[PDB]
Amino acid sequence: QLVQSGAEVKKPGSSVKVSCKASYGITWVRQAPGQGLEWMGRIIPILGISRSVQKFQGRITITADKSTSTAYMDLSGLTSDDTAVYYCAREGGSGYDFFDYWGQGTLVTVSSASTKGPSVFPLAPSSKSTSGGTAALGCLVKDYFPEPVTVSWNSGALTSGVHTFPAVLQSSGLYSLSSVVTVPSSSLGTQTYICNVNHKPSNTKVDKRVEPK
Amino acid sequence: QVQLVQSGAEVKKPGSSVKVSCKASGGTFSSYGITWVRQAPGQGLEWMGRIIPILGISRSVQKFQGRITITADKSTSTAYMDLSGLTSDDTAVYYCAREGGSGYDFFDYWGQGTLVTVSSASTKGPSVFPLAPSSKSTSGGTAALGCLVKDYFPEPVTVSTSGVHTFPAVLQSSGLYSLSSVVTVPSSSLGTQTYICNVNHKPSNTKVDKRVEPK
Amino acid sequence: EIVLTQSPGTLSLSPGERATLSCRASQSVSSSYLAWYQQRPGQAPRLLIYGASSRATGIPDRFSGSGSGTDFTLTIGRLEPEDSAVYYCQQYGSSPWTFGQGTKVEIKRTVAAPSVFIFPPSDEQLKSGTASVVCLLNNFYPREAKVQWKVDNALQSGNSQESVTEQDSKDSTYSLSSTLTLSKADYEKHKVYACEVTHQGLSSPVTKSFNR
Numbered sequence: 185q186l187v188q189s190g191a192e193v194k195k196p197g198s199s200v201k202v203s204c205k206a207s208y209g210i211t212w213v214r215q216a217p218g219q220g221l222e223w224m225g226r227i228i229p230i231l232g233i234s235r236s237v238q239k240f241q242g243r244i245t246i247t248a249d250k251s252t253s254t255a256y257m258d259l260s261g262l263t264s265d266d267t268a269v270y271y272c273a274r275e276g277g278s279g280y281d282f283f284d285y286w287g288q289g290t291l292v293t294v295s296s297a298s299t300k301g302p303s304v305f306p307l308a309p310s311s312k313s314t315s316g317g318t319a320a321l322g323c324l325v326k327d328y329f330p331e332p333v334t335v336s337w338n339s340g341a342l343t344s345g346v347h348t349f350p351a352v353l354q355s356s357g358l359y360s361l362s363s364v365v366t367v368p369s370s371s372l373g374t375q376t377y378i379c380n381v382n383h384k385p386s387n388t389k390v391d392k393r394v395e396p397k
Numbered sequence: 398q399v400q401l402v403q404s405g406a407e408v409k410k411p412g413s414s415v416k417v418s419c420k421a422s423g424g425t426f427s428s429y430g431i432t433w434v435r436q437a438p439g440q441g442l443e444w445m446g447r448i449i450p451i452l453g454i455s456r457s458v459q460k461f462q463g464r465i466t467i468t469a470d471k472s473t474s475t476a477y478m479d480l481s482g483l484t485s486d487d488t489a490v491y492y493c494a495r496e497g498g499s500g501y502d503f504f505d506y507w508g509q510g511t512l513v514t515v516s517s518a519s520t521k522g523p524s525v526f527p528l529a530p531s532s533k534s535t536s537g538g539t540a541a542l543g544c545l546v547k548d549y550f551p552e553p554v555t556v557s558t559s560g561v562h563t564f565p566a567v568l569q570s571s572g573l574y575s576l577s578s579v580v581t582v583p584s585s586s587l588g589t590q591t592y593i594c595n596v597n598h599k600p601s602n603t604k605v606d607k608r609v610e611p612k
Numbered sequence: 613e614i615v616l617t618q619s620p621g622t623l624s625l626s627p628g629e630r631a632t633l634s635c636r637a638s639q640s641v642s643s644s645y646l647a648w649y650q651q652r653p654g655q656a657p658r659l660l661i662y663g664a665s666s667r668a669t670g671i672p673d674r675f676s677g678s679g680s681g682t683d684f685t686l687t688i689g690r691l692e693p694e695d696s697a698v699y700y701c702q703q704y705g706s707s708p709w710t711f712g713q714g715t716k717v718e719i720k721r722t723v724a725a726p727s728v729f730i731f732p733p734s735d736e737q738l739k740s741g742t743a744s745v746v747c748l749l750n751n752f753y754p755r756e757a758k759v760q761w762k763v764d765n766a767l768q769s770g771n772s773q774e775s776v777t778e779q780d781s782k783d784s785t786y787s788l789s790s791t792l793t794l795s796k797a798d799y800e801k802h803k804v805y806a807c808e809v810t811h812q813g814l815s816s817p818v819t820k821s822f823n824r
Contacts, residue, residue, distance in 0.1 A: 205583040221711040284648040286656035306734030
């Protein structure tokens with residue numbers, strides 16, 4: 185399994201070391217938001233050899249520490265157009281350079297605007313709803329700037345009806361996304377002390393309890 | 398710059414014979430002796446003898462004289478001792494080393510070493526033991542997992558290169574001893590690629606490979 | 613460098629129907645040097661086919677791979693709802709290795725008369741900022757659903773913002789969250805707030821009610 189790093193927010197004219205915990209290369213693969221994958225470079229820690237695509241040459245250094253076995257890129261001298269999700273993937277050699285196992289991915293967000301904290305918003309379950317099947321309740325996340333914010337319920341337990349909506353731009357550069365869950369546990373409820381949120385840039389975690397109003 | 402590659406842990410019986418073979422990787426025994434050097438377990442080096450394949454001459458220390466024959470085959474360029482008539486007190490690691498002549502007999506390049514283990518007890522197989530990684534450990538830095546090697550008698554047993562901690566074997570109630578191998582992986586979840594845990598036993602010649610599973 | 617065409621793109625097909633994906637190459641490539649990949653909604657792409665013929669170790673052999681020289685075709689013999697994904701043909705044949713434009717498969721099963729709920733503002737961001745109401749439309753197929761906010765029985769402008777999640781891997785249904793952020797003070801005489809839904813699902817516009 186390939187485990188990567190977390191959403192660097194840098195400024196147009198900076199430097200990002202994306203770390204893929206790593207006879208097998210690591211090839212890196214861009215994907216601009218809502219677009220289609222590219223190639224960026226390849227290394228082999230067994231030999232230290234590195235290769236890069238022509239466009240990204242003079243701005244990228246892909247290295248790896250074979251002993252501690254962890255590979256990194258370092259896209260220095262980057263503009264605002266490189267705001268994209270970057271994957272790390274396993275080579276196979278010469279005639280078999282298809283990308284077998286992939287990394288989770290690390291969204292670099294590069295523009296000098298701000299970093300803002302996930303202000304979590306009221307839940308407030310509707311009273312008279314379904315006759316038991318789906319009592320819908322959701323703790324909303326509005327007013328934050330840099331994505332990601334993962335919001336699991338029951339700190340990763342309730343995984344059966346956690347609907348998450350993609351963040352959409354508001355009037356400011358900040359965007360907001362909404363998390364909802366369905367409970368059959370109508371009155372009282374068993375576990376209602378829930379709604380963990382993790383913000384990778386701000387590092388602020390907020391947990392709140394749902395109450396039927 | 399000639400690397401010296403030796404042989405592997407002979408287990409013999411008190412009253413036997415061991416031909417330790419030091420190989421001159423290169424094809425080249427030049428004007429260069431092989432001197433042999435004992436080291437009792439947890440002790441300090443001695444001298445045992447010297448040869449020159451270029452001239453066939455051999456010399457031995459007084460104590461080990463009448464029990465040791467140090468020969469070499471210049472053509473195939475491989476040198477051997479043959480400690481015949483040995484007791485239980487010779488259980489030690491034996492090195493082979495390169496001379497320099499008359500006034501320059503300092504031991505330049507050395508061999509890896511070959512532990513002779515001499516007592517009529519047994520040979521027993523490396524029964525590899527459960528790994529079982531701990532669940533709730535570090536927050537990613539070091540997820541420790543190790544495949545243990547218990548219940549074997551004659552050492553060595555190679556096991557498992559960046560966090561392979563190996564512990565020296567310690568005597569159990571029986572003459573058998575056990576040692577433990579552990580590694581740290583940054584991939585805590587699924588803790589997978591370590592399904593080798595290759596072990597090599599020089600006497601038994603039994604190799605066991607197992608896969609680690611996070612429980 | 614090889615620019616490459618793909619299939620039509622979004623495809624609507626019932627389960628149990630064969631699906632064909634094309635991959636024409638502008639420049640000639642080797643008869644067997646192209647690999648078809650599949651990336652699920654929100655995840656990392658997983659290898660489906662390598663060499664345009666062989667299958668990835670542990671990939672169900674519905675996903676047949678064929679084609680040679682210029683046109684490469686990926687044919688999915690049977691379709692389940694756990695196939696809804698984006699497929700890219702990468703030609704690791706030339707240099708640099710050019711990924712395909714990518715095709716989106718949409719499994720055409722049900723029309724799911726939707727479930728509409730309101731989550732009207734409560735006294736936690738009615739004690740700072742700008743409040744926002746919201747309209748959840750849970751379990752609905754397909755994406756053809758439009759919601760217009762109704763305020764005190766009076767229709768609203770384009771100050772909404774609707775976000776729709778991708779179809780679930782098993783459910784294959786599309787849920788929505790139309791939002792109406794407002795000026796934090798403006799909650800005086802607007803007694804009721806509602807969202808009006810028009811869908812293939814359910815005869816009428818299903819409007820709603822806040823009061824409280």
